[PDB]
């Protein structure tokens, strides 16, 4: 069983590089963010452009959805995050306190909290309702590349150019684990596995790693793609076969068998670095997005 992703749609609209693409939890919407300071909403199934969300003064590097699919959060170079109501497009809150670009962001399953990672080397935790910063965590000693809450939002994982992945107790802000090899290339991305037992870490040594954080053991590695320059999103695809999906610096989307580490498909079509990929919650659908020479989002679909 290898997947057979075939190109359904090419989604044109962003005037600069696309930075991040995410599927709404209900699976009906695709949100995109871009260097053009814009968020755009697209139909997940027909690729129909829905709306443009604007307000940020500078480019956006990440966008995330609330559990109920009603809210988005964005992380911009203008040093802020904005909470948007998706149906009105209106900015509900502006989240002030980072002293440099906000790079990454995420809601917890509860969706009462936002986690943010910045070039100022901190991870912040914010209240959704009031927009106020609950905690500032001296998380790292270099730009924070990724922040992600576990299955129930009791933990946060952060990655950084400093070469570390760190696990944080959300409620208390206290660091529980630092993961470090005997060699520290920048960690360009991290997220929890759907079940919270593992973390998937990308490093700028063209390498993805599945870690048992609690024991500090690397269980799988995923290689063959190109990742030396950019903070590229990776995913666990769990709808059909059990895959790892990542963008790549060779204009390709890579798909690996989670257990064998075998490349099972490469998707061709983009004409620049695939910076971002997202896996549909229920359907075997992938969204991918590329950089400045491309600026498009592609939607793909497999049988498995």
């Amino acid at each position: 069983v290898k997947p057979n992703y075939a190109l359904k749609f090419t989604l044109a609209g962003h005037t600069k590089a696309v930075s991040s693409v995410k599927f709404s939890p209900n699976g009906e919407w695709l949100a995109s963010s871009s260097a053009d300071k814009l968020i755009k909403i697209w139909g997940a199934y027909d690729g129909k452009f829905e709306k443009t969300i604007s307000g940020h003064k500078l480019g956006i590097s990440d966008v995330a959805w609330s559990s109920d699919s009603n809210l988005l959060v964005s992380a911009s170079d203008d040093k802020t995050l904005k909470i948007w109501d998706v149906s009105s497009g209106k900015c509900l809150k502006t989240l002030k306190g980072h002293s440099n670009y906000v790079f990454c962001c995420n809601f917890n399953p509860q969706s009462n909290l936002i986690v943010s990672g910045s070039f100022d080397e901190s991870v912040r935790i914010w209240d959704v309702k009031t927009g106020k910063c609950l905690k500032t965590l001296p998380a790292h000693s270099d730009p924070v590349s990724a922040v992600h809450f576990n299955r129930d939002g009791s933990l946060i994982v952060s990655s950084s150019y400093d070469g570390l992945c760190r696990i944080w107790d959300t409620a208390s802000g206290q660091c529980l684990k630092t993961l470090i090899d005997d060699d520290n290339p920048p960690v360009s991305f991290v997220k929890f596995s759907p079940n919270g037992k593992y973390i998937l870490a990308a490093t700028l040594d063209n390498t993805l790693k599945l870690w048992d954080y609690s024991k500090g053991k690397c269980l799988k590695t995923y290689t063959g793609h190109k990742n030396e320059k950019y903070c590229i999103f990776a995913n666990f695809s769990v709808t059909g076969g059990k895959w790892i999906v990542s963008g790549s610096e060779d204009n390709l989307v890579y798909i690996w068998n989670l257990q064998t580490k075998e490349i099972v498909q490469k998707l061709q079509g983009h004409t620049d670095v695939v910076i971002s990929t997202a896996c549909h919650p229920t359907e075997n659908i992938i969204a991918s997005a590329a950089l400045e020479n491309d600026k498009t989002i592609k939607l793909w679909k497999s049988d498995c």
Partner: peptide, 5 residues
């Protein structure tokens, strides 16, 4: 920033 190295 993400879209630039």
């Amino acid at each position: 920033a993400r879209t630039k190295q």
